[PDB]
Amino acid sequence: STDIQMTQSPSSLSASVGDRVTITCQASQDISNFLIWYQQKPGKAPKLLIYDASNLETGVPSRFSGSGSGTDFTFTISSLQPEDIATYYCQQYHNLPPFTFGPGTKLEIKR
Amino acid sequence: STDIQMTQSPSSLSASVGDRVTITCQASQDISNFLIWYQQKPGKAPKLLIYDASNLETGVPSRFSGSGSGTDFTFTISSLQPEDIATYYCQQYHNLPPFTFGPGTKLEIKR
Ligand SMILES: [Zn+2]
Ligand SMILES: [Zn+2]
Ligand SMILES: [Zn+2]
Ligand SMILES: [Zn+2]
Ligand SMILES: [Zn+2]
Ligand SMILES: [Zn+2]
């Protein structure tokens, strides 16, 4: 398919350390499991956490996970840590460029 | 290949309006022409400018161009404009995830 739109919700949220947080990402058309999740902090490139929708990238903490296939996807942090403050993006790569990005979800955590 | 490292230079730069600006990207292994260039504005998702190394995305200003194939790539702004302030990333997609990002080039204008 072409002209695929990616959406994310919430656009921003605040939580507390130890909380379980789940954010969502939707593709306007089916993209199977070709969905990546990034974590981006200030002054750094997006960091790969999840690929193929649910595959945890090597080295990434196990408190991160993803699920979904088709159009609806989720990303979960099982127990928040202060360093998890970041913007989280989803990206589809079902076929060819563009590998459309979601608008991102900005997570804050109380200190 | 696997475990491909992407590098970028400069990591940041300041230039003047009208300047011709060239930034570079390297792949630790042969990625052919599977190389994308993004422009990321503060708080926003990365915007596609160039794909397949040298193909200018529809709507993207002509002052942007990309070249290179294999392991070295260049992104050029023929005439720097005030609206070009952003961080620029390259991304490889030669085969499977990770679609490795370069660490980015932060561009600012000296006015
Ligand atoms: Zn398609
Ligand atoms: Zn791997
Ligand atoms: Zn390979
Ligand atoms: Zn090859
Ligand atoms: Zn080659
Ligand atoms: Zn080289």
Residues of A in contact with B39 (CB under 8 A): none
Task: Walk across the sheet containing B72-77 and list its strands.
Answer: B6-9, B21-27, B72-77, B64-68
Amino acid at B99: F
User: What is the 3-state secondary structure of B35-80?
Assistant: EEEEEECCCCCCEEEEECCCEECCCCCCCEEEEECCCEEEEEECCC
Residues of A in contact with B46 (CB under 8 A): 46, 101
Whole-angstrom distance, CA of residue B63 vs CA of residue B68: 17
Q: Is residue B105 within 8 Å of residue B95, measured between CB atoms?
A: no
A98 to B51: CB separation less than 8 angstroms, yes or no: yes
**Is B34's Cβ below 8 Å from some Cβ in A?**
no
Whole-angstrom distance, CA of residue B46 vs CA of residue B34: 17
Whole-angstrom distance, CA of residue A62 vs CA of residue B85: 36
Domains in chain A: boundaries: 1-111
Q: Is residue B25 within 8 Å of residue B101, measured between CB atoms?
A: no
Q: Is residue A98 within 8 Å of residue A3, measured between CB atoms?
A: no
Whole-angstrom distance, CA of residue B37 vs CA of residue B57: 10
DSSP string, chain A: --S--EEEE-SEEEE-TT--EEEEEEESS--TT-EEEEEE-TTSPPEEEEETTTEEPTTS-TTEEEEE-SSEEEEEESS--GGG-EEEEEEE-SSSS--PBP--EEEEE--
Nearest one of A6, A89, A78 to A41, comparing CA atoms: A89
User: H or E segment at B108?
Assistant: strand B105-109
DSSP bridge partners of A22: A76
A97 to B51: CB separation less than 8 angstroms, yes or no: yes
DSSP bridge partners of B37: B50, B90
Closest Cα in chain B to A47: B101
Taking the CA of B28 as reference, the closest ligand is 6
Whole-angstrom distance, CA of residue B26 vs CA of residue B4: 10
B51 to A102: CB separation less than 8 angstroms, yes or no: no
Whole-angstrom distance, CA of residue B74 vs CA of residue A19: 43
Domain at A1-111: CATH code: 2.60.40.10
Q: Which two tokens stand for residue A103?
A: 């608008």
User: H or E segment at B6?
Assistant: strand B6-9
DSSP bridge partners of A61: none
DSSP bridge partners of B85: none
Length of chain B: 111
**Distance from Cα A35 to the centre of ligand 1, integer Å:** 13
Amino acid at A93: Y
